[PDB]
């Protein structure tokens, strides 16, 4: 009716947005009942990068973790993948949006990180750009470990182990079941004939560099079996060094 | 003083739609289109600054970057500083300079006086 004329107007605002106070109709989108119909009129694919940051800034604050997750999954995350493929580097506002998306870590992990690695088509460049934001923003220990467990159980790709390393790089105290998944993750390549990248060894390095205190003799010697079958001229002696100078409990 | 056979007193008390007929074409077009937010703000500021002055003294100067502003008959009497890219020019708005823009008062470039040429 008349509401369709209001949002078709703001469609032409958000497509040419750069700065300033947004129209008040846009700021009350997650308060609506039929919000997904409204969002399609505004045309999220035709939006400017600057608009995308303030769009994310709205959804992260207005509660509802389930409503927040589905915005990232349908609008935000495709746009990130669209620009890394096109411009090869990410836009500033689009980057700033992702840091603002971490105000709800539950909706972040279930909407951005986990769906990205599950697709399989995730490139190395895509992984580092998003993964650096994990290093910048502090994440709750419960949510940090929960994302870490999924990636450990997940199918292996080059992009996948980058995230896993950066989560261990945070150096939080870990739940014990997560450690069991991480050991089982790396020991899954013990019989593998495939040539493993350097980023894989660095992930195994960071695991032993920090969490050598929480490794029992059973899994500790299972790791020494892993390096004996899948070696590296540079990094494998360092992991061998870190295991031999480890004090348990 | 007289502008298009109309005096200042009449001009001031005149309708806004009646000025959309007593200007040059450009100005008429602009007034049909409407004054932008910034312009409105400027005008309001001017109104304030002319109101809050001693009767004998000239009003306090309002600085602005808006050189796209058209001078209305309500601005006659006020002193305005207009930016020319680098510096302001304190300009007393005269009755003669209504059908003009604020830009044509603060010149944006220095006039050329030639230096003697080098290796050409």
């Amino acid at each position: 009716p008349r509401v369709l004329e209001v949002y078709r107007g703001v469609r032409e605002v958000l497509s040419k947005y750069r700065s300033g106070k947004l129209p008040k109709a846009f700021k009350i989108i997650p308060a609506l009942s039929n919000w997904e119909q409204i969002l399609y009129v505004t045309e999220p694919e035709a939006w400017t990068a600057a608009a995308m940051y303030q769009a994310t800034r709205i959804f992260a604050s207005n509660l509802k973790e389930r409503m927040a997750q589905r915005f990232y999954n349908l609008v935000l995350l495709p746009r990130v993948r669209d620009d890394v493929a096109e411009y090869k580097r990410l836009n500033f506002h689009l980057y700033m949006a992702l840091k603002k998306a971490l105000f709800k870590p539950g909706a972040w992990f279930k909407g951005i990180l986990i769906p990205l690695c599950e697709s399989g088509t995730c490139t190395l460049r895509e992984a580092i750009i998003v993964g650096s934001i994990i290093t910048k923003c502090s994440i709750p220990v419960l949510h940090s470990s929960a994302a870490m467990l999924k990636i450990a159980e997940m199918e292996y790709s080059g992009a996948n182990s980058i995230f896993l390393r950066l989560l261990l790089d945070k150096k939080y105290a870990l739940p014990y079941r997560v450690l069991d998944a991480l050991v089982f993750h790396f020991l899954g390549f013990r019989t593998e004939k495939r040539e493993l990248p350097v980023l894989w060894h660095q992930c195994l390095l960071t695991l032993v560099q920090r969490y050598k205190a929480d490794l029992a003799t059973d899994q500790k010697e299972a790791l020494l079996e892993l390096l004996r079958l899948q070696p590296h001229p540079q990094l494998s002696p360092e992991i061998r060094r870190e295991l031999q100078s480890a004090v348990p409990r | 003083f007289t502008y298009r056979g109309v005096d200042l007193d009449q001009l001031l008390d005149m309708s806004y739609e009646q000025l959309m007929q007593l200007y040059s074409a450009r100005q008429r077009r602009r007034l049909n289109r409407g004054l932008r937010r910034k312009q409105h703000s400027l005008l309001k500021r001017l109104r304030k600054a002319k109101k809050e002055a001693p009767p004998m003294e000239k009003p306090e100067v309002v600085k602005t970057h808006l050189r796209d502003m058209i001078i209305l008959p309500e601005m006659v009497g006020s002193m305005v500083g207009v930016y020319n890219g680098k510096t302001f020019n304190q300009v007393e708005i005269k009755p003669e300079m209504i059908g003009h823009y604020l830009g044509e008062f603060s010149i944006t470039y220095k006039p050329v006086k030639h230096g003697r040429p080098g290796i050409g």
């Binding site: 008040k24 999924k150 | 806004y16």
Partner: peptide
Amino acid sequence: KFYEQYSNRLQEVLNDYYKEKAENCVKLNT
């Protein structure tokens, strides 16, 4: 929780939008 997962006021804002989109170009006041 992670793996096991997968109007009156509107009309007021609508009228406020047109109110603002009128105040951006005045064409009237003295």
